[PDB]
Design a protein around this ligand. Structure first.
Ligand SMILES: [Mg+2]
Length: 102
RNA sequence: GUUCGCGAAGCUUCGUGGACAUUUGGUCAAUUUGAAACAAUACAGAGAUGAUCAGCAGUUCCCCUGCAUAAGGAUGAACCGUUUUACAAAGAGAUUU
């Protein structure tokens, strides 16, 4: 991964692969988090955010996804957004203990 | 042009007022640059399983043939890979205040 174009090519390919894996097992939720992580690594915060949102939409009742997303939000010192996300999660799911605790 | 009236010249001819009839067609403009596919060459090449082979489905932001809610398409196409956290409790040893 020397040049920018090379990176783009790599990244693009990876994204495509992820998409392919999703299209079959949309309801997986491990894959989605992996994808999100990858996006985060790539330092495209938008993309990562989108992916997480998509995952949530697929399976709202999946705490791990929520928590990982929150972590990601916090990781990038983007607290306000993270806070909002947390609030949303709480609204969605009150009787799960964990979100509140987080 | 048709004509039904008026006014001048010789029923014939000019000059007039009316009535009749009244707004088409274009999502488009004629060769490369607004998107057809097969074919061809080269290169490989055939689902499980040790091998050979049948058929059926399944997922999809892939379609094709088919009148088709028949049927058929390489098991029609891509799926075979990546896969480290709602993560705590107990015990032992070490440096810092
Ligand atoms: Mg066959």
């Amino acid at each position: 991964i020397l040049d920018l174009e090379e990176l783009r090519e790599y990244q693009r390919r990876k994204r495509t692969e992820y998409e392919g894996y999703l299209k079959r097992n949309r309801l997986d939720m491990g894959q989605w988090i992996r994808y999100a992580q990858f996006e985060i690594e790539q330092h495209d915060m938008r993309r990562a955010r989108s992916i997480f949102e998509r995952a949530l939409l697929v399976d709202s009742s999946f705490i791990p996804l929520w928590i990982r997303y929150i972590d990601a939000e916090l990781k990038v010192k983007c607290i306000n957004h993270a806070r909002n996300l947390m609030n949303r999660a709480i609204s969605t799911l009150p009787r799960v203990d964990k979100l509140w605790y987080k």
